[PDB]
Amino acid sequence: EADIYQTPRYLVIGTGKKITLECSQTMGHDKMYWYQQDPGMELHLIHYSYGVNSTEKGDLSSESTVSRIRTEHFPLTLESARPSHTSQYLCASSEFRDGNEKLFFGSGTQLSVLEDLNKVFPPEVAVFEPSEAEISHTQKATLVCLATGFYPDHVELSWWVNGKEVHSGVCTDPQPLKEQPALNDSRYALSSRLRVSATFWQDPRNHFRCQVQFYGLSENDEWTQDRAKPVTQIVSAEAWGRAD
Amino acid sequence: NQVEQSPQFLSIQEGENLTVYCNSSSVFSSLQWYRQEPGEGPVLLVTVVTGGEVKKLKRLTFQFGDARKDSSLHITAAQPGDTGLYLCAGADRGSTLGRLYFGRGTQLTVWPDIQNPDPAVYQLRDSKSSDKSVCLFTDFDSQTNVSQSKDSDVYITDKCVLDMRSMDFKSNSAVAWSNKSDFACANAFNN
Numbered sequence: 001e002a003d004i005y006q007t008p009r010y011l012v013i014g015t016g017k018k019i020t021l022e023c024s025q026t027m028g029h030d031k032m033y034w035y036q037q038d039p040g041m042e043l044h045l046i047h048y049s050y051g052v053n054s055t056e057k058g059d060l061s062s063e064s065t066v067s068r069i070r071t072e073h074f075p076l077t078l079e080s081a082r083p084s085h086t087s088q089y090l091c092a093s094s095e096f097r098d099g100n101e102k103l104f105f106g107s108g109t110q111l112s113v114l115e116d117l118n119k120v121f122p123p124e125v126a127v128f129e130p131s132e133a134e135i136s137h138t139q140k141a142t143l144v145c146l147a148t149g150f151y152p153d154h155v156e157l158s159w160w161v162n163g164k165e166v167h168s169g170v171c172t173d174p175q176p177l178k179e180q181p182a183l184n185d186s187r188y189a190l191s192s193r194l195r196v197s198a199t200f201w202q203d204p205r206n207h208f209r210c211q212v213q214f215y216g217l218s219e220n221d222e223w224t225q226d227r228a229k230p231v232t233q234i235v236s237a238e239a240w241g242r243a244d
Numbered sequence: 245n246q247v248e249q250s251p252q253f254l255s256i257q258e259g260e261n262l263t264v265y266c267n268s269s270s271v272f273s274s275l276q277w278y279r280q281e282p283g284e285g286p287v288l289l290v291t292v293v294t295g296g297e298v299k300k301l302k303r304l305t306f307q308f309g310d311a312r313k314d315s316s317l318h319i320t321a322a323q324p325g326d327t328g329l330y331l332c333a334g335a336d337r338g339s340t341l342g343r344l345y346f347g348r349g350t351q352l353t354v355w356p357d358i359q360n361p362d363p364a365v366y367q368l369r370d371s372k373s374s375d376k377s378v379c380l381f382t383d384f385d386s387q388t389n390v391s392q393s394k395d396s397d398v399y400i401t402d403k404c405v406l407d408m409r410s411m412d413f414k415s416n417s418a419v420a421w422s423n424k425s426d427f428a429c430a431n432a433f434n435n
Contacts, residue, residue: 004285031342042247043286043331043346050341058343090285094342100274100293101335101342105285128378131366140408144368144378144419171404171417174282179399191401191419193380195408239371 002026006091006106010154010215014117014222019078021109023091032074033058033092033103034066043090049074081113112152117221119185120230122214123150127237130201132244141201143194143239145210149179151187154215159194162207169195206241245270245339249332249347256322257355257386263318264350266332273337275308275315276344280329289317322354324405356405356414361385367429379420379429390418391435398422398432 004025013019023032030051035043036059045058047066055066065077074093078085091106114120126148130141147157153176159166172192180186192210200206216230223229248267256262266275274293278286290299292308292315299306303326305318319326329351333344363384370376381390393400401419408414420432 009283033342035346042348043333045343048342092285100291101344102288102291103276103344104288107284126374126376127371128368129371131368131380134364134366134380134382137364138362138383142366142368142380142382142417144380146378146419146421168410169406169408171406173401173404175402177399177401189399191378193404193406193417193419195406195415197408197411237371 004091004093004104004106006089006109008109008215009107010110012112012114012120012152012154012216013081015081015083015113015115017081019081019085019111021076021078021089021091021111023074023076023106024072025093025104026072027093027095027104028071029093029095029104030071031094031101032068033094034064034074034076035090035092036062037088037090038086047076083113083115085111085113087111110154112154114152117217117223118225119151120216121149121151121187122216122230122233123147123155123190123212123235125210125212125235125237127208127210127239129239129242130198135198135201139198141196141198143196143201143208143210145192145194145237146189147191147210147212147235148189149187150190150212150214151185153188155190156213157190157192158211158213159192160209160211161194161196166194201241202243203241204243207238208241209236209238211236245334245336245345247332247334247345247347249330249350251350252348253351253353255353255355258321258323258357260322261318261320262322262352263316264330264352265314265316266334266347267314268334268345269313270334270336270345271312272334273312274335275312276333276335277306277315277317278331278333280331280349286329286331319352324354324356326354327352355386356407358383358385358414358416361388363388365429365433375424377421377429379432380417381420381433382415382417384416386416388416391433393420398427400432 034047049068128144176188176190178186277289280286295310329349331349332347
């Protein structure tokens with residue numbers, strides 16, 4: 001059964017820390033790979049393995065290491081995090097099927113390495129209620145959710161109606177927006193819409209919640225600021241349907 | 245080995261045909277296409293091995309150039325679900341085993357047709373008590389271009405399409421906001 005699995009999906013860490021990115025497959029594939037892709041570039045091979053005891057550098061300059069002691073596992077280690085390690089890390093395995101090396105990828109780790117942890121901020125979340133000018137004209141009601149002030153760009157926004165996640169009538173910006181573009185470490189904003197029928201909205205028993213999962217600092221992380229520690233957390237805002 | 249993909253971005257309406265291209269200065273023993281969805285690993289679509297070969301998989305038609313230095317992906321009757329990053333990867337068997345050289349991809353977005361466009365800019369109030377508000381530009385047709393802010397204190401998102409499935413209804417929207425104070429929804433989306 002199964003496939004290929006990578007964790008964590010998201011990581012923000014201080015500089016100089018050791019990092020291990022995990023990769024496993026249950027397909028019994030001999031060949032396994034690590035690819036990296038910075039903001040501006042294509043995927044590029046950093047390490048590969050022909051099987052147990054085989055570990056090869058695909059990029060000579062890379063200061064990551066791998067090991068292969070089990071067919072199943074191909075972990076990647078960064079002994080000393082530098083900002084330049086901030087990247088997307090994709091693990092893959094392959095096999096020969098019909099004389100073709102066919103690759104299967106994990107879903108990646110988004111790694112953010114920061115010189116200064118004080119630039120980490122969780123999102124603030126607001127829900128804006130449908131315009132009555134929208135409702136009376138269109139018979140439909142759009143809720144807007146704004147998540148603001150977060151850094152890095154490591155968030156997942158979801159909509160929950162009456163306690164259950166919804167996908168119908170939802171659109172979330174594919175990319176966030178820089179609140180202060182003139183800073184390459186600018187905080188970020190993201191919006192999403194949830195559109196329901198006006199009568200669904202006008203029902204007071206209906207409960208709407210915009211939820212943003214932020215991935216930030218972990219428990220053990222050092223912190224000294226006069227402001228709550230920006231740990232991994234959920235931030236939400238909610239709204240009730242209202243007649244009117 | 246140096247793999248060039250074009251165009252970088254392609255935005256198109258559903259129903260349309262399209263071709264995307266992958267070029268290299270180096271000969272490949274084989275060439276793959278992958279599709280990557282955001283937040284997820286690329287997914288293998290096809291492998292071509294023979295110069296001149298045409299592989300058709302449903303609405304996607306892949307061709308391998310005769311000299312094995314280039315390939316194209318042609319999509320017939322594009323559907324919103326075709327949206328994604330199309331990555332081209334070539335093998336140099338002269339290099340090593342498992343050495344695939346990747347292009348940066350074509351980001352393809354396929355937009356739904358809007359049946360009854362009814363553009364409007366609406367003001368929404370914050371759910372909790374705030375002086376804060378947003379502007380919603382919604383129900384515009386697909387050749388409408390939402391202009392970017394450019395002005396420091398105003399934020400404008402790109403267009404997003406949502407599907408109200410039960411209703412057989414889709415709409416475009418874009419959101420604008422400011423801290424305050426000179427900002428009015430009336431000025432927000434002006435062209």
